């Protein structure tokens, strides 16, 4: 909506969740033995944990050959980190393969720069909103469109998650922002 494009404050991506399959079985113990800057506690969890500072990210690799990559600032950067890890595995001599890379989640956040009344929001959207100030200090909004979850605070802070596409975050936020402006203090 042009009419309100100061909605268009474009919410910042903070975290990306992707998975990829290396296409071969591996031995975490040998990996943990060999690899640098990595941790492996089979008595606590199954996956080996590895961490790079590059695009500042972390990946968890299984023995089945599947792994999950997190920590990216963006999906390209996430494909880069995913590729960097698979490269490292290639450098181990293991049959590393870039197969089935896919984004599972995107996270965004932003600030609206004004205080609002959660009591009104929970009243008018009672069917979807859920607010428990005794338990969690935020407010949980479950949209049915770009099936997204939102975290709303009195400061005006917002976080959005459950996303598959960045457009969906913008769409969720452009849709809800006028309501929030309609409940400004």
């Amino acid at each position: 909506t042009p009419a309100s494009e100061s909605s268009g404050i474009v919410p910042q991506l903070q975290n990306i969740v992707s998975t990829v399959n290396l296409g071969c079985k591996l031995d975490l113990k040998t990996i943990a033995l060999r690899a640098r800057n990595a941790e492996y506690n089979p008595k606590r969890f199954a996956a080996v944990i590895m961490r790079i500072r590059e695009p500042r990210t972390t990946a968890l690799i299984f023995s089945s050959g599947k792994m999950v990559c997190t920590g990216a600032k963006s999906e390209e950067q996430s494909r880069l980190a995913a590729r960097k890890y698979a490269r490292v595995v290639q450098k181990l001599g293991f049959p590393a393969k870039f197969l089935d890379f896919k984004i599972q989640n995107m996270v965004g956040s932003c600030d609206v720069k004004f205080p609002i009344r959660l009591e009104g929001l929970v009243l008018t959207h009672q069917q979807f909103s859920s607010y428990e100030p005794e338990l969690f200090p935020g407010l949980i909004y479950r949209m049915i469109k770009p099936r997204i979850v939102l975290l709303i605070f009195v400061s005006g802070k917002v976080v959005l998650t459950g996303a598959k596409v960045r457009a969906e975050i913008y769409e969720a936020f452009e849709n809800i922002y006028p309501i929030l402006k309609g409940f400004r203090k």
Partner: peptide, 8 residues
């Protein structure tokens, strides 16, 4: 600089 964890 670097770290490792294996066999406790």
């Amino acid at each position: 600089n670097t770290y490792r964890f294996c066999d406790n």
